[PDB]
């Protein structure tokens, strides 16, 4: 009913002679190699709407038919989307057939209204000790994850997905906003092996929906893919009534993509160069993540800080919404401590005694004090000496080092490649376990007894086993066996070990090859549309 009027990059103007589509409505272009969905951005006047494309606009002709769907982008929601990968417009990109849609919901939605909001403030118990003590997660909150590569972020993502599904009974949505496709495939395959995503007949036992908008998608497709993740998580909140986790992987790339679609729509950029609507592009997304009377959405969203500048307007606008930060560090990760949550850098707004209670608060406030006093004397130890300083300053060092060990925890999703079983640690067992290390009920136990254990009922059961070990090392003996001709051959006997490698001078470079004959004549189209050589003179 509408026809393409202008194609300027990712921005399409289409023209409706009848009634115009509403702003944010979805338009489908009739007859195109890929399904091209346009989202109406503004009404330009003279019966023209300006649209941002969710796919490539190459091959688009002025006057192509464009059908109004009468609604915004509508995506499949429900339990049938669990364990599936879905793109921004709702199509399966996991190559496993159609998505069993319980309903199809508009991805554009106002935030839950004031009466629908919950006036209460409470902890999302995660089963991770360092997260439940030192930086608790608000149910319905937004959590910044300051990880990276090799700090075990993905195994922390899958452990949050695991423990929220197991304890609180809520599902998860992973919205990968502008992610590399190599990394989005890595998360898909690691979710398959760790059990949080199942394929085939047991698809319904999955705990996570993956909603992917990759980096090679146009900036409109990446700017809306976090709202497709919201809409899947809002069905579980409002219809299923659950406590949903939502992972917006790189909320900065949400900002960055929305900043590109404002620049393509001809809007004057704001301070440092973001869109003028930066606080309402974020606040439109972040306010749908809340607690209602039905259920909750809690968002763990990864935060990139541009140019290591916290006062940049993209993190500064994001940090107004964030209720906790979990900083994953490499320094904690090379000490073998997993998860690599920095116990001092990680912050929470939920960590004040009017909302978690004073018996929880003073433990976390006391644990952080012990770790802080230990790490400001590390230019006292290396400069002067270990046995230099006082016995009380050594009492903290012994207490902090078995607190710094006790923040480690083995994960249930990591046990398929680590052997150590997973430990869900309850909240009361975390506080009461850390009261004791703070006072000194376990100063006699070794520090590596406090390592990769569940709670304080398992620190005693690790110091018992290690202490005995000296009773069971007099079982056998230990010296050299047959110095270097036991099974260590000669080097020229090892050259004849080497297997045959067939090296072809041929490349095998014409497997199934067309080899079209290309002529260097210039071929054009005449006015019939018939292909013809280029006419001779101008």
């Amino acid at each position: 009913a509408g026809y393409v009027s202008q194609v300027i990059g990712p921005v399409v103007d289409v023209r409706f002679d009848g009634e115009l589509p509403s702003i944010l409505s979805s338009l489908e272009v009739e007859g195109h190699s890929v399904r091209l969905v346009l989202e109406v951005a503004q009404h330009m006047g003279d019966n023209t709407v300006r649209c941002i494309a969710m796919d490539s606009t190459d091959g688009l002709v002025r006057g192509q038919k464009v059908v109004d769907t009468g609604s915004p982008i509508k995506v499949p929601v429900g339990r049938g989307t669990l364990g599936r990968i879905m793109n921004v417009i709702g199509e399966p990109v996991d190559e496993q057939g159609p998505i069993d849609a319980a309903d199809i919901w508009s991805i554009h939605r106002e935030a839950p209204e004031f009466t629908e909001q919950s006036t209460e403030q409470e902890i999302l118990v995660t089963g991770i000790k360092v997260v439940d003590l030192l930086a608790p997660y608000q149910r319905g909150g937004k959590i910044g994850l300051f990880g990276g590569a090799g700090v075990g972020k993905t195994v922390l993502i899958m452990e949050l997905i695991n423990n929220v599904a197991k304890a609180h009974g809520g599902f998860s949505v992973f919205a990968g906003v502008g992610e590399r496709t190599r990394e989005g495939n890595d998360l898909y395959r690691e979710m398959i092996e760790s059990g949080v995503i199942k394929l085939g007949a047991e698809r319904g036992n999955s705990k996570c929906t993956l909603v992917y908008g990759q980096m090679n998608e146009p900036p409109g497709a990446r700017a809306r893919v976090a709202l497709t993740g919201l809409t899947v998580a809002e069905y579980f909140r409002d219809i299923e009534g659950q406590d949903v986790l939502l992972f917006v992987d790189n909320i900065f790339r949400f900002t960055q993509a929305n900043s590109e679609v404002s620049a393509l729509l001809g809007r004057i950029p704001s301070a440092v160069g973001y869109q003028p609507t930066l606080a309402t592009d974020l606040g439109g997304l972040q306010e749908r993540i809340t607690t209602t009377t039905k259920g909750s959405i809690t968002s763990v969203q990864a935060v990139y800080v541009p140019a290591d500048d916290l006062t940049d307007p993209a993190p500064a606008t994001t940090f107004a919404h964030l209720d906790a930060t979990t900083v994953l560090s490499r320094s904690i990760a090379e000490l073998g401590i997993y998860p690599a949550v920095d116990p001092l850098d990680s912050t929470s707004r939920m960590l004040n005694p009017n909302v978690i209670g004073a018996e929880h608060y003073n433990v976390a406030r006391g644990v952080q004090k012990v770790l802080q006093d230990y790490k400001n004397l590390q230019d006292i130890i290396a400069i002067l000496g270990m046995d230099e300083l006082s016995e009380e300053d050594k009492l903290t060092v012994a207490r902090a080092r078995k607190i710094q060990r006790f923040l480690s925890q083995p994960f249930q999703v990591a046990e398929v490649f680590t052997g150590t079983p997973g430990k869900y640690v309850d909240l009361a067992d975390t506080i009461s376990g850390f009261q004791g290390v703070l006072t000194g009920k376990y100063d006699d136990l070794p520090e590596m007894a406090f390592y990769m254990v569940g709670d304080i009922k398992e620190v005693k059961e690790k110091a018992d086993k290690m202490a005995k070990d000296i009773a069971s090392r007099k079982e056998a003996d230990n010296k050299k066996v047959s110095e270097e001709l036991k099974d260590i051959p000669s080097l020229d006997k090892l050259v004849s070990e080497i297997k045959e490698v067939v090296i072809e001078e041929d490349d095998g470079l014409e497997e199934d090859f067309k080899a079209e004959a290309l002529s260097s004549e210039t071929v054009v189209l005449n006015e019939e549309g018939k292909s013809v050589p280029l006419p001779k003179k101008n």
Binding site: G9, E260, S262, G266, R267, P269, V272, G273, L509, E511
Partner: protein
């Protein structure tokens, strides 16, 4: 050179031709990826491609962003 293609859009070439050369070099290199072999594509000065693309966009009166680059 018996394993190498060279796609060369030099300095005197038009800015559309330096914009399209990493893409046309990639399509030549995507032949080996798609037929089971292995490719190595090198876009030497990808920062010179973006300068050529900024030239086309400011001249097509597309709205500029940071350092006059497009959206």
């Amino acid at each position: 050179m018996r394993y190498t293609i060279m796609v060369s859009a030099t300095a005197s070439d038009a800015a559309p031709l330096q914009f399209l050369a990493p893409y046309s070099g990639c399509a030549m290199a995507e032949y080996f990826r798609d037929t089971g072999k292995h490719g190595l594509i090198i876009y030497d000065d990808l920062s010179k491609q973006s300068v050529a693309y900024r030239q086309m966009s400011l001249l097509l009166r597309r709205p500029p962003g940071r350092e006059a680059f497009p959206g």
